[PDB]
Design a protein around this ligand. Structure first.
Ligand SMILES: Cc1cc2nc3c(=O)[nH]c(=O)nc-3n(C[C@H](O)[C@H](O)[C@H](O)COP(=O)(O)O)c2cc1C
Ligand SMILES: Cc1cc2nc3c(=O)[nH]c(=O)nc-3n(C[C@H](O)[C@H](O)[C@H](O)COP(=O)(O)O)c2cc1C
Lengths: 129, 129
């Protein structure tokens, strides 16, 4: 779901389009998923998460989305502070003013884990039994 | 966020990998976003949403994800029952048994709308003021 949003429940960052898309904000979930702290993250471009085997063509689609002011999603290999790799389903959306110009982007990250048959059944079942 | 999941809050479908990826389940949000009903959706492949200008190369990445049993996200133009186009950020994840084989896929759809500066500030602000 997502794109109400909550800085305490959800994993997202906000980039300043006035500032070469530097991170100007990160949610609690971001620090928790990546293991980085505000002193590492704020003011940096979010590509410090990228590393060996990060797909160059997915990065290029992200870049084009950003350049065009479009929403976008893509799967990217990323790395936590301790070097652990994870798959990140990254959702991006532009934020505009009234002038119709992009002032910021929000990126929502999802760390892919295994969804098992058991947990899916519970979601599908329309009650609490 | 997403990939607990709720059939009443979230927009998703579940496909049966035993059945040429026919939809075997759809959430309340799916029927509400697409305007289709269970009598249209259940048993069909979800490409009835695709239409003019749906990107062929995004569809091909989805197909490859499905074939490889990988999670995936991508932005796809889709159409509601009344013909209205919408951008769908589609997230896909495989569901496996214990044998380690893919029995189902879950797809979570997000209809892209405008995120405004005002609603973003409220999300970022760490309180209810
Ligand atoms: C709001 C936002 C969030 C982003 N989050 C991530 C992220 O979680 N992981 C990642 O690898 N790249 C992320 N990116 C992409 C990188 O910051 C960067 O835009 C991409 O690598 C292209 O950089 P370049 O054009 O300088 O090469 C994000 C971008 C934005 C605007
Ligand atoms: C669980 C699941 C959900 C899907 N949801 C959507 C959807 O919301 N919109 C869409 O255009 N395609 C969706 N697809 C993709 C199509 O069903 C189909 O897999 C894709 O068009 C490739 O079809 P083909 O290999 O038969 O050409 C979904 C697929 C799965 C497995």
């Amino acid at each position: 779901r997502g794109s109400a949003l909550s800085t305490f429940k959800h994993t997202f960052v906000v980039a300043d389009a006035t500032k070469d898309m530097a991170i100007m904000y990160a949610s609690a979930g971001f620090y928790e998923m990546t293991q980085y702290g505000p002193e590492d993250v704020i003011g940096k471009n979010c590509k410090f998460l990228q590393g060996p085997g990060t797909d160059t063509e997915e990065v290029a689609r992200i870049r084009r989305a950003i350049k065009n002011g479009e929403s976008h999603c893509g799967r990217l290999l990323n790395y936590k502070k301790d070097g652990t790799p994870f798959w990140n389903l990254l959702t991006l959306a532009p934020i505009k003013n009234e002038q119709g110009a992009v002032v910021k982007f929000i990126g929502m990250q999802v760390e892919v884990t295994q969804f098992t048959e058991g947990e899916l059944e519970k979601a599908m079942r329309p009650n609490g039994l």
